[PDB]
Each structure stands twice: as C-alpha cells, then as structure tokens.
RNA sequence: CCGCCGUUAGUUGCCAGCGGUUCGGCCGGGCACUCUAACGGGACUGCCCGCGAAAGCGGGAGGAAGGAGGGGACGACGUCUGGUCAGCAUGGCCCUUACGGCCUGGGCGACACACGUGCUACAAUGCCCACUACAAAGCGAUGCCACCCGGCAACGGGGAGCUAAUCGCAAAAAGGUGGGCCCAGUUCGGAUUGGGGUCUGCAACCCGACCCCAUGAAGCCGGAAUCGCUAGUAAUCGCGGAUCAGCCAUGC
RNA sequence: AAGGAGGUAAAAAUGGUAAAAAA
C-alpha cells in the first residue's frame, strides 16, 4: 500500500513515503523544485526512478530532516533506492551492480587532537 | 564638483562619489543622502543642479571635514605634547598609542623595520 | 499520572532496577510505561599527558551519567506500598513528579 | 606507497550529461570544496557556447581534449649525480588529465569579465587551436622532439 | 573606563576640600596613580606614586577627564 | 616507557569504581572532596592492617564506610573498639550517617596493592632488594596467578644512579582487556630518597 | 610561597574579583577544572587511580 | 565510536491510521517510521570462475558492509645520565624577626632588530545590500535567559520558562533568489588614529572588551627555501565548550 | 641464474667534544 525507504547519508534522515501518481513529491513540506533549488546533485538523486522509468507513476510524501541539504539529496537517493526494493524484489537483483543499495562510508571523521583539521598537521620548524 | 576640498568624483553612484571624500564614509553617504534628498542608486553625473546645490548646502552646514578635522586632531596632539600624556608621550616616541606590543609588531604606527646585527642568543643547538 | 525519572551513574543496575520496578508495578497494579531511555547524560573532559609543558599528546576523559523514565496510571494502595520502600539503588537517585 | 600501485578511482558519471570527463573538468574548475558554483559556471558557459555557435558542447569538449594532447611529456632519466632531461610516450589517462588541467589554468589565466565567460572564450579559442593550453601542448611536443636524443633514455 | 559616574579616590575629594579650605602649601602625595585628574584638581603638583619614586606633575587643563598616573612614564628607556 | 593505567584501562567492565553513589552535577564536587578526605584520613590512621578497596556507597546522607582489608581482628579492637573511634571520626568529620565495613580477602599474595605494600615494607626496612623481591614474586606465584610483574624503581641502595629493577614471572597481557589485572603501587621511602614499587598481578580470562 | 596562597583562597578576600580556583588535592590555581575542583594532573592521577566517579577513560 | 538489520521503550517524533484544527502534531490517539539507549545479529576468502608447490592471487556473487570496512583508546624489552623538587611528592644544602607573610602600586605588555607559529588580506568562483531553508556537539538555576520596550548601536529596563530530548544560548555559514560594483589601491583591505558612549568589575593610565562618526595606511599574490595532505582526506565554512566578572581566543 | 671463493674499475665538503666516576 505504501512504498517506504529509510534514506541516510552523512547523518540526515530521508523518511521516504510513497503512493502512485505522476510527480507529486513533497520534500519535508515543499516541492522538490525549491527545497533543493539550484543544487545540481538534486536532479541526479532523481536517477533511481529514472533508471526504472516509473518516475511518473508515484505520488510521494518525503519527510526529510537532519544534517545537510546536499546530504539530504543523497539521502533521498538512498530512501528511493530502499523504497522500491521493497515492493518489487526483482529490481533488487539488477540494482546492486549499479550500487543503489549501498548507503555510505563517508562521514566526517572526528577532530583528531594534535592536528588542526582531524589530519591536517600544524607546521614544522626545526630551524 | 568641488563640494569638499577640491573634491571631484565623476560618473558613478552618488553614494560612492560622496564616499570618495575625506570625512564622509558610506554611512555618512546614505545619511546626507536621506537628509538632502538625492537618490543613491541614480548616477552622480546625470544629476540635476538644483537638488545638487541644496544638497551641498546641507553638507557643509551640519558637519565639517578635512580642514578643521585633521588640524583639530593635531591640536589635540599639541595637547598630547602639553605635558606629554602617555598617549602623546608614545605618540611623540613614534610608537603605538594603545599599550599593545613593540617586541615584534609595529609596522604601521612606525615604519617597516631598522636592521641591526641581532645580538645573538643563548644555547639552543 | 505518575511520572518517575531515573537519575543514575551506570546503565547496569540502572536497567536492573527498571526491570523489577516496572514488573512489581505491573504486579501490584496495572499498566506501566516501560523504562524509556532518556538520552544518557555524558560530560566532556580533556587533560594532557604529564605535568611538564607539552600542550600536545594528551588523554581525554568523560563523565557517564544515565537518565530514564517510568510511568503508571493507577495510584493503587499496593503499588504505592511496594514501589515506595522496596528499593536498593545504592548509587542511583530518582525524581517523583506529577502530571 | 611502495608496496602498492595506488589507483585512479572512478570519479563521477556527470550529475547531468552522463560522462566522466564533464564532471572531471568540473572537478578541476571547482573552487576547493565548492563544486556548487564552479559546476554552475561551467554549465552556464556550455549553454552559452550552444547559444553562440552550433557545434555540440560534448563535441567541442572532446575537441578541447584532443586539440590539447601531450602525446609525449618531458621528464628525467636515472644517472647518479646527474639527470637526463628525457621525454616519453605518455598514457591516454595522464594525457587527458594534463590536457584538461592545462585548459583549466589557461581558463584561469585569461583576464576576462566572469568565470563562465572565461571558461567559455577559453574553450572557443583552445578547442579551435588558437589557445594557451594548446600552446603548451605543442610546446611539450617540441620539447619531446628536440629531446629525441633522450628517446632510449626513457626511464 | 567609567560610564555612569567617574572614578577617582574619595580621599582625593575629601583632601581637595581641605587644601582648598586654606589654599595651603603645595604637594599632593597620591599613593595610587589611578584616580582620574577630575576637573576640581585645578593644576597643582601631583607627586603621584610610581613604584620607584613619586613622579611630581604640575597639571594643566589638556588632561582634565583623563587619569593621574596616566602622566608618569615609569617604564624607563624608549625607542 | 609508559603504561597507561592498567586499572584506568580496566574501566570497561574489569574494574568498578571505589565510590558508587549518586552525584548530581552541583553537589558532586563537594561530594568528591569530602569523600576524598575520608579516604585520605583512612589510608593513614586506618593503615595498621593494610587495605585495598576504599569503596563508598552513598545517596542522601547515607554513608557506606566500605573497606577491603587484609585483616579485621587487630583493627576492629579488643572489644570491637577500634571500629568505634574510627567510624565516629568519620561521622564527626562527616556529620550524616556512617556504616563501617571490614570485608577480608583470604589471600595476601593475591591483590597487587598490598603485595607491593609488603614489598615496599621490606625495603623500607632496608632489605636486599632483588633477592627478597624476586622471591616475593615467587611467593605470589606460589599462590597462583598467571603472571606477576613486580618492578621496583628508585635509588637502589643509594649510589646516586636511581635505576629500575626487573622482577617478574609468568605471562602478563595488560594490553588485553579481559585479562583482569590487579595492579598496585607502593611508595618506597628511604632516608636517602624516594623509590618506586610497582606490582602487576594478572588473574584470568573468561570473567 | 605556596602555603599563604591556600589561605588566600581559603579565607576568601574582600572584592569579588580576587578569588581564584584551587586544586585542593595538589594546590594550584591555574587550569583547575572547577567542576571537580581539581587541576589537570590532580584530575588525571585521581581518574587513573580508579578513584574518579562518573568519568571514564574516554575512547570515543 | 561509526554505516545495514534485529527485542523492548514513548511529553522527541508521528496523520504513517483516523477526528478536529485561531488550520501549530495545536487539540485525541499509535508506534510502524525519525529518533533516543541497553542486550544483540551480521562477513569468514564463508561461496562461484581461474591462476599459484602454499601463503596468496585476479575476477565474480549474495550483501548495508569485501578480503585491513573506516576512526579511536591500546604504545613492549629498552635508548636518551631527555625534561620537571616552579602542579605533586622526596635525599641533601642553605636561610630563620627573613631567601617567610601581608598590602599597595609598578611589572612579567619594554623596542633599534631577528625568528617561530597563526589570522585577515591583496580581491570579479570576487565584496556589498535584500530574501529563504539542512546541522551534529556542548553549555545552562543567584546560570541560561525567551519576550516586549529603550538606544544609531554598544547595552540597559520591565518581564515567561527550565536543576532541561520538553524553556533558552540559536543568529550556522556556505548554498540558493533578487540588484549593485564594472578592473580603480577600487564600496577591494581593515592597520594607524582622534572624536564620543556603554558594559565588566572596588576600580580599565601603563592594561579589558563592545559600540557609533570619521581618518580609511600598508598591501595589486610573495625569490634562497620550505608546511601539510591518499578519501568525506585537501581546501572552504560555520558551530559549541573547557578556563572565565571581564577579556587581550587569530589560542586549545 | 644459488652460494662460497679467485684477480679487475667504485664510492666519506669538514670535523674538535672531556672525564674521576655509578652495576
């Protein structure tokens, strides 16, 4: 009845709800074409429903908050790729060689003490 | 356009044209711009002389500029030589008037730097 | 209508308390709001290696205090009775508040 | 490293067109962590080409790539307290990289009016063959040729 | 410094009023170079306390609302 | 040549605090102060028969004067009298509600603090370091650990050069977490300076 | 010096801006964590000794 | 600690289910979903194709997770007669109405150079003005202070709520949308400095910070040589805290 | 291509730094 996807990237929660339709996809209260206005990685995150051609046949409710805008976009990619892998486990077997299953492995490493930016070491002297 | 001390700015926003003047910043620009009337966005070249004249009339009347100003400062500086208050003591010394630092940094209140020979140090290896 | 908050030092006896307490309430009364995990209160400390002037190379340390929540619905004689005195939190204190 | 052979690692299949090289050039225009406005700039430039001439943007892109190709790049040989200044047949990967980056700094060099404008005009002349990155391509070629004594002195 | 009021020793007030109650001999021997040269000090010799000696300054007017020991250099050698 | 505190290493589930009570942000400091003064006063004027644990259970006014000692008898008093004055010294200096405890471990060569304590006691009374101390390591290994590293630093008989002495036997993995190593440090003090006595006793896994 | 310093902090002077922290289990004023009322090395030693409550050898 | 999934939990969340809505998850209710925090599950070259006398090796599959999955805390035997009795201890040595205490000021902020580390800059990917959204973490009761009013601002007056996932710091900046500037020491840069206010605290001269008008310098991208950086790493940009009345914080 | 060995060409701008001693 609903297509749900848990979308997460660099800590940002893309709660992805789905019903069928045309293009009604509201991101946390607003249309896609404003809640991520200007950013080019936005349309890229629309790839999952584009590479299955069923981008139209959906009427989404997409609650998405936490972390960062672009990160939310990537998180939307994950939420979609998790929402459709639910209500058609056949797309699953072919979707893995594209990677639309992997979540992430790239979060901001802790400020390492002894260095400035967690790895960026301060200047040397000796002389 | 010699409103202020031979001040002639030419074709630009009236605000920038007014700011190209001693004793008149951008805040003062919008200030006299709201007090004399003249519109900021409109260029200073294509103006109309009436608003211009009443404008310059308001300008020099409510506040003054370079002539008295810097001279006034230098007079307060004469006082800073009066018994040589620590402010003017150091201002006479050719050094920063604040109580900052002179171990190293002093490249504007004083000139650049005046080379010596170091005098060296104690063991460091 | 009973709102009890758990203030402790270690999650161990913290939830060990929460188990019997809630059950004993479910025992001598009725419905009990399960031991909700209030975001564990932790503090931050950052010292250095030795006393001698080193600035860099250090050891960091952090305070561990734990917070939880338990509620019920009825002020039964028997609940009040048991869940009053019958305690041994040793190193844990709590807060009774109403709603 | 000295145990490994590092890598190159796949970049990005272009967030728009669908090609690695587009967002590679974007990657080098990029203002250190601000891919945002740099990518925007490049694209404004692209559509502006497509409002100027008639030839395809990816086409003229491949033309930038080719028209600035360092077929043989100069380096140095092993001989103790001395090094032979020695050119060598480069790999298409390193040629592409060098190329696109030279188009990048040739785009930076032009004192024009705006970023998109710069990248654009740069791409015009340089794809045509009357550009600076091109001048350094042809250059390193002359260098490789004049150093054809260092032909079997390639490390 | 001060904003609503103005700092000076109260003993400076009370001791202005006395040497004013006679127009008496010179020397004010302040053992605190702080205390502003507030208006009612006219222009008499101020042997303000340094830490070394007692810097004696004949005050004028170009200094009124600005600290006493603000006139003693103390820090020897300049440049 | 370090060794981050193996006991501060044990902090996971391999060593509970020597003070378990509730401290609410505010009163926590004064709690730590009062309690540390209790501890410190004990450590000397309660010495007599050597203790390890200086544990205290508190909450609201309630106090638990809890101690792990190597002897209870000749430290409780000839008529339960030593407990009296001491406990009430606590109560007098900490006016609330005190409750003594003299729990005893039936083994001395087990538990590193007191082992090191005796080790330092021998040298404090001017004994031949290496001999007696190595055979003390052998005592602990006549008790039954899986390792015992009792190093001893400081001035060795004087001779200015204060080095460190190597005494150990059996494997000791203080790197390992589930090793459960009691470590105990005793202060050696000669009239010619200060020497260090570290005991490292390793117990066992699966605990 | 040192002894009178503790008395200065013990007696607590006249004006407010004269007080200063003090590691009671070592005796120091600077960098004394005014949560534990302890210095940096005081704190470190007391934590490592298996004595400091609440806190743990942080390894986040 | 951190990415996928598992059990419990519901004043954070939530219409996902329904009712209403000054149409605010605000008014009822659920726990699936966010989430919060304890016990877990999961990955081992375990499997598929080939190579290697083995280790190992390429490629491929299922997988959130591929062969060390990422970061931490972990730092032996021991070198350095390394440093520190000026955090703390402790051998000796010296002084003992003073090499001890107080108080008060001055000072460790000095300036003719030198150097180390750092900040903002020199700029059209730019700065200025307008407009709208996504942070994790930490802090907070004579603290946090919402809020309204006062003032050009600094900041002050009245005044709700909180020992807090339920009240507040809080204004994220970058992005993005609208206009200026139009290659000039430029509306670039804020250094010098005076002119006046506030706030701190007993009290701000040497010595705090903050604000308002103005002066608006140097500086037009840095040779001999050298810093860091292998993946959410460079860089860019913001945020909280420790200590604190205040703040010299471009520090950590 | 292994070792081991036998006869031929290689490679250091400079460096002074003591001492009764401690186990």
User: Long-range contacts for B98-107 (Cβ within 8 Å, ≥24 apart)?
Assistant: B102/E79
* Closest nucleotide relative to residue F160's CA, C1' based: I22
What is the number of CB-based contacts under 8 A between chain F and chain G?
48
Q: How far is CA C55 from CA C44, C46, C47, F169, G37, in A?
A: 18, 11, 10, 38, 21
Alpha-carbon distance of A45 to A74, in angstroms, equals 6
In degrees, to the nearest 5, what angle opens at C-alpha C40 toward C-alphas C35 and C44?
170
Alpha-carbon distance of F194 to F186, in angstroms, equals 11
Are G26 and G38 within 8 A, CB to CB? yes
SS3 F75: helix
Are F109 and F140 within 8 A, CB to CB? yes
Cα B52 from chain centroid (whole Å): 25
CB contact under 8 A, C90 and F24: no
Specify the CATH number of the domain D1-155.
1.10.455.10
G39 is in an annotated binding site: yes
Please tell me which chains touch B, using 3 or more CB pairs under 8 Å as the contact test. E
Helices D92-109 + D57-67 axis angle, to 10: 100
Q: What residues make up the domain containing A10? A: 1-127
Alpha-carbon distance of D142 to F77, in angstroms, equals 103
Residues in chain A: 127
Alpha-carbon distance of G32 to G20, in angstroms, equals 9
Alpha-carbon distance of E39 to E61, in angstroms, equals 8
Residues 6+ apart with CB under 8 A from C99: C1, C2, C3
| Protein-nucleic contacts, chain C 79-98 to strand H, CB < 7 Å | none
Are E79 and B93 within 8 A, CB to CB? yes
* Closest nucleotide relative to residue A67's CA, C1' based: H135
* Cross-strand bridge partners of residue C61: C45, G57
Q: How far is CA E47 from CA E20, E53, F11, F204, in A?
A: 18, 9, 66, 80
Q: How is residue F42 written in tokens? A: 């004990």
Evaluate if the CB of A90 falls below 7 Å from strand H.
Answer: no
G42 is in an annotated binding site: yes
Q: How far is CA E39 from CA D136, E36, E54, in A?
A: 77, 9, 22
What domains, with CATH codes, occur in chain B?
Answer: 1-71 (1.10.8.50), 72-118 (4.10.910.10)
Evaluate if the CB of A40 falls below 7 Å from strand H.
Answer: no
* Closest nucleotide relative to residue D81's CA, C1' based: I11
Alpha-carbon distance of C56 to F137, in angstroms, equals 38
Nearest to A60 by CA among A102, A15, A2, A18: A18
Nearest to B3 by CA among B51, B43, B42: B51
Mutant choice from A41, A99, A108 vs D, greatest count of D C-beta within 10 A: A41
Specify the CATH number of the domain F107-207.
3.30.1140.32
Domain ranges of chain E: 1-79
| Protein-nucleic contacts, chain F 96-155 to strand H, CB < 7 Å | none
G15 is in an annotated binding site: no
Evaluate if the CB of A26 falls below 7 Å from strand H.
Answer: no
Token pair 């356009």: residue: B1
Alpha-carbon distance of D72 to D97, in angstroms, equals 13
Alpha-carbon distance of F147 to C45, in angstroms, equals 34
Q: Is the minimum CB–CB distance between G25 and chain C shorter than 8 Å?
A: no
Q: How far is CA E53 from CA E48, E50, E77, in A?
A: 9, 6, 16
Q: Is the minimum CB–CB distance between B102 and chain E shorter than 8 Å?
A: yes
Alpha-carbon distance of A51 to B10, in angstroms, equals 60
Residues 6+ apart with CB under 8 A from D89: D71, D72, D154
Are F42 and F67 within 8 A, CB to CB? yes
Nearest to C67 by CA among C6, C3, C2: C6
Alpha-carbon distance of G29 to G10, in angstroms, equals 12
**Are there at least 3 beta-carbon pairs closer than 8 Å between D and A?**
yes
Nearest to D88 by CA among D139, D135, D5, D147: D147
Q: How many domains does chain G have?
A: 1
Q: How far is CA D134 from CA D101, D128, D146, in A?
A: 12, 9, 18
**Are there at least 3 beta-carbon pairs closer than 8 Å between G and C?**
yes
Cross-chain CB nearest to G50 (options F8, F21, F29): F8
3-state SS of chain D? CCCCCCCCCCCCCCCCCCCHHHHHHHHHHCECCEHHHHHHHHHHHHHHHHHHCCCCHHHHHHHHHHHCCCCEEECCCCECCECCCCEEECCHHHHHHHHHHHHHHHHHHCCCCCHHHHHHHHHHHHHHCCCHHHHHHHHHHHHHHHCHHHCCCCC
Q: How is residue A83 written in tokens? A: 């929402």
Alpha-carbon distance of C65 to F25, in angstroms, equals 10
Token pair 């800590």: residue: A11
Which residue in chain G has the smallest CA separation from C62? Answer: G55
Q: Which of the listed CATH numbers 3.30.1360.170, 3.40.710.10, 3.30.860.10, 3.20.20.70 matches domain E1-79?
A: 3.30.860.10
Are D37 and D28 within 8 A, CB to CB? no
Q: How is residue D102 written in tokens? A: 């030279």
Pairing mode, strands F181-190 and F168-169: unpaired
Q: How many domains does chain A have?
A: 1
* CATH topology assigned to domain F16-106: GMP Synthetase; Chain A, domain 3 (3.30.300)
Q: Is the minimum CB–CB distance between C47 and chain G shorter than 8 Å?
A: yes
Residues of chain E with Cβ-Cβ distance to B83 below 8 Å are 57-60, 62-63, 71
Evaluate if the CB of D105 falls below 7 Å from strand H.
Answer: no
Q: How is residue G17 written in tokens? A: 């801006």
Residues 6+ apart with CB under 8 A from A106: A10
Cα D52 from chain centroid (whole Å): 23
Task: Produce one character per residue of A18-50: b if its CB has 16 or more CB atoms within 10 Å, e if not.
Answer: beeeeeebbbeeeebeebbeebbbbebbbbbbe
Residues in chain G: 60
Listed as ranges, the nucleotides of chain H within 7 A of a protein C-beta are 1-5, 8-11, 14-16, 33-39, 61-66, 69-80, 82-84, 87-92, 100-118, 124-126, 133-142, 163, 165-166, 172-177, 180-183, 186-187, 191-195, 197-209, 212-218, 226-237, 241-245, 252
CB contact under 8 A, B85 and E70: yes
Residues 6+ apart with CB under 8 A from B3: B21, B56, B59, B60
CATH of the domain at A24: 3.30.230.10
CB contact under 8 A, D16 and A44: yes
SS3 F87: helix
Domain ranges of chain F: 16-106, 107-207
Pairing mode, strands F181-190 and C93-98: unpaired
Are C8 and F24 within 8 A, CB to CB? no
Q: What is the DSSP string of E23-71?
A: T--S-B--S-S-S---GGGTT-EEEEE-SSSEEEEE--STTTTS-SGGG
Distance from CA of F30 to the nearest CA of C (A): 16
Q: How far is CA F129 from CA A68, E37, F165, F168, in A?
A: 65, 74, 9, 13
Alpha-carbon distance of C3 to C69, in angstroms, equals 7
Resolution in A: 3.5
SS3 E77: coil
SS3 B59: helix
Residues of chain D with Cβ-Cβ distance to A39 below 8 Å are 36
Rounded to whole angstroms, the distance from the CA of residue A122 to the C1' of nucleotide I13 is 34
Cα D88 from chain centroid (whole Å): 18
Burial of D95 (C-beta count, 10 Å sphere; 0-12/13-18/19+): buried
Alpha-carbon distance of D25 to D99, in angstroms, equals 10
CATH of the domain at G39: 4.10.830.10
DSSP 3-state percent helix, strand, coil across chain B (nearest 5): 40, 5, 55
Task: Report residue C46: phi and psi, to 5°.
Answer: -135, 95
Alpha-carbon distance of B82 to B76, in angstroms, equals 9
Evaluate if the CB of F159 falls below 7 Å from strand I.
Answer: yes
Evaluate if the CB of F161 falls below 7 Å from strand I.
Answer: yes
What is the number of CB-based contacts under 8 A between chain C and chain G?
43
Dihedral angle computed from the Cα positions of residues C25, C28, C31 and C33, in that order, rounded to the nearest 10 degrees: -10
Distance from CA of F56 to the nearest CA of G (A): 11
Alpha-carbon distance of A73 to A66, in angstroms, equals 11
Q: How is residue B49 written in tokens? A: 């002389």
Q: How far is CA G58 from CA C7, E34, G54, in A?
A: 21, 49, 12
* Closest nucleotide relative to residue F161's CA, C1' based: I22
Are F108 and F185 within 8 A, CB to CB? no
CB contact under 8 A, E71 and B86: yes
Evaluate if the CB of A41 falls below 7 Å from strand H.
Answer: no
Q: How is residue C32 written in tokens? A: 């009990």
Are D92 and D14 within 8 A, CB to CB? no
Residues of chain G with Cβ-Cβ distance to C65 below 8 Å are 54
Q: Is the minimum CB–CB distance between D36 and chain A shorter than 8 Å?
A: yes
Alpha-carbon distance of C63 to G57, in angstroms, equals 9
In degrees, to the nearest 5, what angle opens at C-alpha F186 toward C-alphas F184 and F189?
170
3-state SS of C45-86? EEEECCCCCCCCCEEEEEEECEEEEEEECCCCHHHHHHHHHC
Burial of G50 (C-beta count, 10 Å sphere; 0-12/13-18/19+): buried
């Amino acid at each position: 009845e609903q297509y749900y996807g848990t979308g997460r990237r660099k800590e940002a929660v893309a709660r992805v709800f789905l019903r069928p339709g045309n293009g009604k996809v509201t991101v946390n209260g607003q249309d896609f074409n404003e809640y991520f206005q200007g950013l080019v990685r936005a349309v890229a995150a629309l790839e999952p429903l584009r590479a299955v051609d069923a981008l139209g046949h959906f009427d989404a409710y997409i609650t998405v908050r936490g972390g960062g805008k672009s990160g939310q976009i990537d998180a939307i990619k994950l939420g979609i790729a998790r929402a459709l892998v639910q209500y058609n486990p056949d797309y699953r077997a072919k979707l893995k060689p594209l990677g639309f299953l992997t979540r992430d492995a790239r979060v901001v490493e802790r400020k390492k003490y002894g260095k400035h930016k967690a790895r960026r070491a301060p200047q040397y002297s000796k002389r | 356009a010699r409103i202020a001390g031979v001040e002639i700015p030419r074709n630009k926003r009236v605000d920038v044209a007014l700011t190209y003047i001693y004793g008149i910043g951008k805040a003062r620009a919008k200030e006299a711009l709201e007090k004399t009337g003249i519109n900021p966005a409109t260029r200073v070249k294509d103006l109309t002389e009436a608003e211009v004249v009443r404008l310059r009339e308001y300008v020099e009347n409510t506040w003054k500029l370079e002539g008295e100003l810097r001279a006034e400062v230098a007079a307060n500086i004469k006082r800073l030589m009066d018994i040589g208050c620590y402010r003017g003591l150091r201002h006479r010394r050719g050094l920063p008037v604040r109580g900052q630092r002179t171990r190293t940094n002093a490249r504007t209140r004083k000139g650049p730097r005046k080379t010596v020979a170091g005098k060296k140090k104690a063991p460091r290896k | 209508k009973i709102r009890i908050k758990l203030r402790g030092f270690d999650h161990k006896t913290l939830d060990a308390s929460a188990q019997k307490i809630v059950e004993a309430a479910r025992r001598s009364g009725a419905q009990v709001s399960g031991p909700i995990p209030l975001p564990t209160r932790v503090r931050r400390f950052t010292v250095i290696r030795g006393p001698f002037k080193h600035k860099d190379s250090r050891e960091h340390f952090e305070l561990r205090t734990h917070n939880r929540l338990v509620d019920i619905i009825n002020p039964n004689r028997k609940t009040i009775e048991q869940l009053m005195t019958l305690d041994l939190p040793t190193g844990v204190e709590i807060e009774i508040k109403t709603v | 490293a000295r145990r490994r052979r590092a890598e190159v690692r796949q970049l990005q299949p272009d967030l728009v067109y669908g090609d690695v090289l587009v967002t590679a050039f974007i990657n080098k225009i990029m203002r250190d962590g601000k891919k945002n406005l740099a990518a925007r700039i490049f694209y404004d430039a692209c559509k502006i080409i497509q409002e100027k001439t008639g030839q395809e943007p990816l086409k003229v892109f491949k033309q930038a790539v080719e028209n600035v190709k360092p077929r043989m790049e100069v380096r140095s040989r092993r001989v103790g307290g001395a090094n032979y200044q020695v050119p060598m047949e480069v790999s298409p990967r390193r040629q592409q990289s060098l190329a696109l980056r030279w188009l990048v700094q040739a785009a930076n060099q032009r004192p024009e009016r705006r970023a998109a404008v710069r990248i654009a005009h740069e791409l015009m002349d340089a794809a045509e063959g009357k550009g600076g990155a091109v001048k350094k391509k042809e250059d390193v070629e002359r260098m490789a040729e004049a150093n054809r004594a260092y032909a079997h002195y390639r490390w | 410094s001060l904003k609503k009021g103005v700092f000076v020793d109260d003993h400076l007030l009370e001791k202005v009023l006395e040497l004013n109650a006679k127009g008496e001999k010179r020397l004010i021997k302040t053992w605190s170079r702080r205390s502003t040269i507030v208006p009612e000090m006219v222009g008499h010799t101020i042997a303000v306390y340094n830490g070394k000696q007692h810097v004696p300054v004949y005050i004028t007017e170009n200094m009124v609302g600005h600290k006493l020991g603000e006139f003693a250099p103390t820090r020897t050698y300049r440049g | 040549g370090n060794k981050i505190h193996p006991i501060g290493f044990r902090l996971g589930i391999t060593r509970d605090w020597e003070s378990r009570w509730y401290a609410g942000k505010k009163q926590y400091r004064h709690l730590l102060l009062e309690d540390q003064r209790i501890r410190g006063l004990l450590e000397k004027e309660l010495y007599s028969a050597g203790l390890a644990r200086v544990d205290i259970e508190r909450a609201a006014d309630n106090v638990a004067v809890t101690v792990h000692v190597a002897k209870p008898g000749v430290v409780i008093g000839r008529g339960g009298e030593r407990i009296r004055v001491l406990r009430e010294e606590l109560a007098k200096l900490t006016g609330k509600n005190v409750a003594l405890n003299v729990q005893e471990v039936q083994n001395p060569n087990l538990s590193a603090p007191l082992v090191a304590q005796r080790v330092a006691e021998q040298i404090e009374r001017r004994f031949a370091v290496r001999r007696a101390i190595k055979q003390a390591v052998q005592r602990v290994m006549e008790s039954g650990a899986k390792g015992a590293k009792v190093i001893v630093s400081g001035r060795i008989g004087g001779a200015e050069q204060a080095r460190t002495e190597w005494a150990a036997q059996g494997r000791v993995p203080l790197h390992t977490l589930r090793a459960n190593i009691d470590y105990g440090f005793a202060l050696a003090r000669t009239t010619y300076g200060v020497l260090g006595v570290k005991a490292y006793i390793f117990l066992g896994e699966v605990i | 010096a040192r002894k009178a310093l503790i008395e200065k902090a013990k007696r607590t002077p006249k004006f407010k801006v004269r007080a200063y922290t003090r590691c009671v289990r070592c005796g120091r004023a600077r960098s004394v964590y005014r949560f534990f009322g302890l210095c940096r090395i005081c704190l470190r030693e007391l934590a490592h000794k298996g004595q400091l409550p609440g806190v743990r050898k942080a390894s986040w």
